[PDB]
Amino acid sequence: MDKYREIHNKLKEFSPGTLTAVECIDYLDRLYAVRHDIVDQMIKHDWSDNKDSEEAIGKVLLFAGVPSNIITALEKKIIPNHPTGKSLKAFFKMTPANYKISGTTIEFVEVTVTADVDKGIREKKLKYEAGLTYIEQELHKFFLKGEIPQPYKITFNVVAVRTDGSNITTQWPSRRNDGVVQYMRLVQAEISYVREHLIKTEERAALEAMFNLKFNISTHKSQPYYIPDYKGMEPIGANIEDLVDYSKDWLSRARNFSFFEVKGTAVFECFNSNEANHCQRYPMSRKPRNFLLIQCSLITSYKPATTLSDQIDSRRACSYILNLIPDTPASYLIHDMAYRYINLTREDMINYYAPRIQFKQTQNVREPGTFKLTSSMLRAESKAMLDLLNNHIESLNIASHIVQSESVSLITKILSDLELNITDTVLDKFFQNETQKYLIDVLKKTTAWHIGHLIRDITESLIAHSGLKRSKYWSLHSYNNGNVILFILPSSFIRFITVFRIGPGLVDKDNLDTILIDGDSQWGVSKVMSIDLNRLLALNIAFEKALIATATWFQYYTEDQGQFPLQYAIRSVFANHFLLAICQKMKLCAIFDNLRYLIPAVTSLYSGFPSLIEKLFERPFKSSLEVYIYYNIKSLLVALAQNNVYPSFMSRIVYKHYRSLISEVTTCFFLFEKGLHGNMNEEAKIHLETVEWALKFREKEEKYGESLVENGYMMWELRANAELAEQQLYCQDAIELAAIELNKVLATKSSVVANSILSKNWEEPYFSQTRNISLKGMSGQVQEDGHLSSSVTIIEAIRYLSNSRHNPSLLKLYEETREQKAMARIVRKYQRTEADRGFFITTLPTRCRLEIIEDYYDAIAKNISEEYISYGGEKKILAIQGALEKALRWASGESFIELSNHKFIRMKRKLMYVSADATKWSPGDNSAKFRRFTSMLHNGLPNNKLKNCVIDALKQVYKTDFFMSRKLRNYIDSMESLDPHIKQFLDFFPDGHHGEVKGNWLQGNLNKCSSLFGVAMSLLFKQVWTNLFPELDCFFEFAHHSDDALFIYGYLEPVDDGTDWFLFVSQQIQAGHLHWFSVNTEMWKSMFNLHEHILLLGSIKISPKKTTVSPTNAEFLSTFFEGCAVSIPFVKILLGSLSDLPGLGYFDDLAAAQSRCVKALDLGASPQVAQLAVALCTSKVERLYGTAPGMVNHPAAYLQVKHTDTPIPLGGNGAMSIMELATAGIGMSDKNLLKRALLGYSHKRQKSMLYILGLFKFLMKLSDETFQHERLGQFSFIGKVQWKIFTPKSEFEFADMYTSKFLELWSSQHVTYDYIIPKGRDNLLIYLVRKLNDPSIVTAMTMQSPLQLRFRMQAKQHMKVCRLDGEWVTFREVLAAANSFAENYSATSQDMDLFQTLTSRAKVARTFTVREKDQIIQNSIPAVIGYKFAVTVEEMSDVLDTAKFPDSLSVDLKTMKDGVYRELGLDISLPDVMKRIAPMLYKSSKSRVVIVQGNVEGTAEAICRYWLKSMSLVKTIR
C-alpha cells in the first residue's frame, strides 16, 4: 500500500495531458506491479512460505530435501510435452510466485490478475504444469531407484483474479479480502485516470494500441493468413529390402574405381601425354607475344616525380631523342612528337604544367598536360602508324626444349634484374626490430622497389591523361632524369609508347618495337600498346600489392620455420610477387586457381589429378611467363608426387607444413584482380554450359518421357534398364528411404523441429526484412524489345509496393505471385555489387519461392547441427570433432569374425578419409527430387499445410525462362562465321530472347536443402551397407560444411598373411553371397563405389576432379573449413583495401581502408603485417587527396595546429596504430582529441585548445547528419565535410518519387525509423525512397560503372569537390575557412554541454562484443531505441512487431538508462542526448568474429591479451 501512495503522490503533480507515452507506460506498469503485489503479499502472509522474495524451482526442490546431484543430473533433461521444448535446467531458474513444502508435498501457486480468468489460468498452466509434472515423474523414477528416501508429490494451482476483484473470495477465501478489494479498486481507478487524462490527446491512440499489444491482443488482431490447401504427395511403398537386393546384385560384379593412384611416374606421363596432345591440336607459333605492360629500366635510385623536375627531365629527354635516327614508323612518331614538344612556346610551357584552375587555353595547348599535334607536321610513317592503329588463336611449342630454354632464360634474367641491389608504441619496438630490419630494410635496396615507384608514377600520368576532355590530345612525360620517356596518343582504351634506356629491369628485347644506338647508349622503343582502366588501376598499386604479398609470405614463413627468411629468399619472393602483379592476365589467374586444387591432388593416396592436369591445357600458351610458370608448376608437382617436407613454389626453401604451401599459391592467385573476370569470354561459357545442360535434360525427357524425368523413376525400372542411374534423374524409392533414415534421427526432436519451423515468422511482412531490400541483383520485367532488365531488389520492392495497397507476408506474396513463370538471366558485369554472389539473377517471385524453401529447410536442418551439419559458433566444430573422435576410438580396436565354431579371424581396423564437393550446386541437377523428399520428411507439425506450400513452391520453380544477355546477342550477331556449337545454342532460343530450362534452379539459394538431402542419402548408404554385411563391424561417418563434405570409411584388413580371409570370402561366395566378391580386397574401394552409386541415385555426382582420398587428414582439415565466410584468408582483405574505395570523401575513404585493415587483422593477420597494410593504405589515400605532408592540401600549411592534432575530416591522420583501431574504433581518435581539448580549455584557458574546439565546431556546422543504419559509409560523431559525388547519366527509377525536402521533414519527424524497418506500406515506401537517395547507396549501386571507376581515379588534389557555403570549392579553401572560423570563435555553454556529451596450434572462431550486452537487456538494442523514440501509433506498432519480447521493453529502457548513467553518466530524459549517443550503443550491440589461435575465450580482454602475445612474430612476449 505504501508503493501505491508513492505512485499516487508522484501522479498528483502532473496535470492532465502532460505525461508522455513512455511515462504513462511506466506508470501503468508499476501500478500493475502494485496491484499484483497486493494479492501476492496477502497469499504470502496467509499460506506461502516465501515471505520476502520469490524462489526458483531448483532452490525450492533443494529446500524440500531433493539432493543437489539429482537436480544437476535432471538439468540435462528436456521436457517432452513443453511447447517450447525447454530443458529442466532453464525450468529450474524461473520463479513461481508462491510455494509451500509440507513433508513430501510441494505445492505451487501462481498469482495473476486479469479480466479473463480462464485465459490467465490456462496460460499459467501451460507455463508451469507440464514441467512440474515431468519433474514429479522424474523424482518418482529416482525414488524407485532408491536414491530418494521418500517420493515427492508436486501440485500446481492458479489464482486468477478479475480486474475488479469480485472473484478474489472464490479464488482464495480469506478474512482479509475486503481491504485487498478496496485497495485494488482504488488502484484500478487510478489506472483509469492515468489512461484517460494524463496522456496527450495526440498520443492517446498510440497508448491504447500499446495497451492492446502489451497485453494478449485484447482487441487488436488480424490473423487473415488461411494457408491455402495445396495438394501434397501420397507416400508410395518403398522397402529397404529392394535397395539391399539391388546393391547385392550391383556388388557381385567388378566396378571401376573413379580415381587413380598417385605416383610421380603417373603424373609425369600424364603431363607428357597432355603436352603431346596439345602441341598437335593448335596452330603452332615461333614468336612469343608481349606480356609486360610497361617496359623500363633503372640504374640509380628513383626519386618521386615532381612538376618542376618533370619539365627539366622532358627537356633533356627530348634533346636526347632528337639525336636519334628512327627506323620504324613508331620511332618516326616518337621523333615527331619530341620535335613538337621542343618547338612549344614559353606560355605553352607554362600552361602545360599549370593546374586546371590556373590553366588557360592556347592555340597549341588545349588542355593542361597535353598538346595538339596536327596531321600537317606528322610524317608519312607516323600517318601510316596512326591509320593502321585506328583502322583495326595460336599456341607455343611447350613440348620443345628450345622454347623451354628461351622462356626460362628470359624470365630468370628479368627476375635477377629485379632482385639486383641498386646503387613510442609497444608495437613500434617490435616492428622496427623485426619487420623493418628483415623486410623493409632488405626490399628497400632492391631494384624492384624503385621500378614499382616508377610504375606508380607512370600509371598516375596515364590516369591523369585518361580524362574525357584530355584523351583527345597527345601527351609527353619524362622520368629518372630523362632516362624514361612516355608518349600518349589520342585515345575505352588508352594507347601509349615507352622509350627507355636499355639496362637491367623490365626489358623484353624480343618484344620491343626497335632498339636505337647513339654510341655506347642503347634506347629501347616499345610497341604502341593499349590498356584499359582496370589494368591501369591494377598497375598503379602493383608495388603495394607486391609488398603486401611479400609481407604475408614473410609471416607464413616465420610461422612455419619459426625463424626469419634470409635476404636472397625474400628478395626472390618480392621479385616474383612484383612480376605477377605487373602481368595481369586471365591465363595466369586460371592457372593459379587450378593449382590450388592440383596441390592436394598430388599429395594424397588417390585423386582425380589427370582431369586437373588436362584442365591446364584448355587455353593457349602465348607469353614466355606462362611457360615459365607452367614449368615451375610441373617440376613442383612431380616432386610432390614423388615425395609420397614440402618444396616451396617461389624459392629454394622447404616447408614443414602443407598449409604454408597452400598459402603460397593462395596468395599467388589473390594477387590477380577480379576486374579481369567477367569479360566477354566467361559469360558465353556460362551461357553455353546452361544451354547444353538444358538440351541434355530435353533429350532425356524425349527418351524416357516427361513424367519419368520429373517425378523420378521406379526401382524396378532401374533393375531393368541400369542406365537410369545417371545425373538429372532420381529414384523415388531412394528419396523416400533417405527421408525415412533421416526421420529415424529427426523423430526424437519433433517438438524442437516444430518450434524452429514456427520461429521463422511466416507471418511478418516480406519487404520489412533486410534481405529483401538489400543491394543484390534481380531480374526486372520483360521489356518491349523482349529482353529482361537487370535491376536491384530494392528497386523491385519499391515497384511492387507502388502498385500494392499493403505489405504482404511471405505466404501471401507467394499466393499472389504463384501463377507467374520464373525467369532468370546473367548479371550484367557493370551493375554488380559487393553483395552479389554467383552469376544468375532471378525475378521477385522466384526469390520468394526460393526463400520459402530455404527457410523451411534451414529450420528443419538447424536441429541436427550438432551431428552432421556445421553452421557457426559453438556448433561449428562439434560435428567434425565427433566424427574424428569416433573414428579414432573405433580404430583403436580389433575385429573378430566367426568362420566356424569359436575359431575367429582377426582383422586390423584402418581408416580412410574422402573430401568431396558433394553439396556444391551443379548445373545438371534436378529440383523435383526435393518434392518427394519434403513430402516424406517429418517436421512434427500437426498439419501438412506448410509442407504442401513448400512442395507447391518447389513445383513452381521447376520451369524457368532463361534470358540471354544483350551483349552476347550483339556478339553473336557480329561475327560472320557461326560455329556448329553456336548454331545449336541459337536454336535453343526460339525468339532470340529466352528459352525454357527445366530441373536446374540456376544457383538459387538452396544450399541447406541440398546439404540435408545429401545427409539423408549418406544415412541411407550407411543403413544399406550395415544391412549388407551384418557380421562385419564396418565403420562409416561423415560431416558437411557449406558446400564440402568429408566421409570417413573404417575398413578391415587381414592380420598376418591373407589366407583365412580369402577362404572365408570364397566360402561366403559359394554360399550364395555373391556380393562378397567385392569385399575380397580393398573393402574401402567397394565402400566408396556403393556410396557413389547411391548418391548418384539421388542425382548427386561426386566430382571426379576435385575429390581427394587419403589415409590421413592433412588436406582435409583446411579445405573442409575453407569456403566459409569466417575462414576467408586475410590476403584478400589486405589486397582489397588498396582498391574499390568508396570515393565518398577523404575521411570516410580513410575510414573504409582502416576498417578493411582491421577486419583483415581479425581474420588472422599478424599485427605487424596489419600495421604495414595500414601505412600503405593511408599513404595511398593521402597521395590521392593531396593531404600528405609537403603537398598542396597539407593541413599544417593552413592551420595553427600540428598534423597529429587535426581532426580526420580536416585532413587529419588519426591514431595510426592497428591495435588502437581494432580495440577502440576508427572514429575514437576524434573523440580523444576533443577530450584533450576540453580538458585543456576548461582547466587552463589555453588558446590553442580553443582553436581546436573552434575547428570541431566548424566541422559540426558544415554537416550534422543523423545516423541511419542503412548507410554504408562511416558515421562521424563530430560532423563531416561534404564532398561532390558521382552523378550517373540517368537517376534510378522511383528515386524521384518524393522530393528531398519531403524526405528531410519525414526523417526529422520520424526518429524511430532511423533504427528499425517500417512495417506499413506507406512508411516502407518512404523509407525505401529515402534509402535510394542516400549518397552511400547511390555510390554502392554504381560501384563497377566505368564512369564512377574513372572518377574515383582522378586526383582530387586540385578539384573543386568540397561543399562550402552552398558552393563547390577546393579542399584548401575549406581549410582556410576552417582556420578563419577557428580564429574568431568563443566557447558557449550550449557548445560546452554538447562537446561534453559527444565525449564519453589450432585456429578457432571465437565471436566477441565490444562492450557486451547486459543480461537484463533481452531485446535488441535497435528495438529498445525505437521504443524510446516511438510516438506515432504506426511506428510504435512497427517497434512492437520488431521486438522479440514486446512485453519487456520498458524494463529494457530503464535498464539501458541505468547503465548509461553508470558508465557514461548521462540522463536519457533530456532532449537530444539519445540523438547523440545512440550510434555508440548500436555499434556496441553488434558482434565481431575473430580468428584466434589458442585457448582464448570470447571476452574482449582475452582477445586483446592474445593480440599482445602475437605482437612478436618469432618470440613469445608473455
Swiss-Prot record:
For endonuclease activity. Binds 2 Mn(2+) ions in the active site. Displays nuclease activity with Mn(2+) and also some with Co(2+), but not with Mg(2+), Ca(2+), Ni(2+), and Zn(2+). Its main location: host cell. One of its GO terms (molecular function) is metal ion binding. It catalyses: RNA(n) + a ribonucleoside 5'-triphosphate = RNA(n+1) + diphosphate. Its EC number is 2.7.7.48, 3.1.-.-. The active site is at K124 (for endonuclease activity). One of its GO terms (biological process) is RNA-templated viral transcription. Mg(2+) binds at D1044. Residues 901-1087 form the RdRp catalytic domain. Mn(2+) 1 binds at H36, A97, E110, V111. It is found in: Host cytoplasm, Host perinuclear region. The keyword Nucleotidyltransferase applies. GO terms for cellular component: host cell perinuclear region of cytoplasm. Signal peptide: none annotated. Changing K127A: Severe loss of cap-snatching endonuclease activity. It comes from the Viruses. Classified as His(+) endonuclease since it has a histidine upstream of the active site that coordinates the first cation. Interacts with the viral nucleoprotein. The N-terminus contains the endonuclease activity (endoN). The central region contains the RdRp activity. The C-terminus contains the cap-binding region. Belongs to the Bunyavirales RNA polymerase family. This is RNA-directed RNA polymerase L.
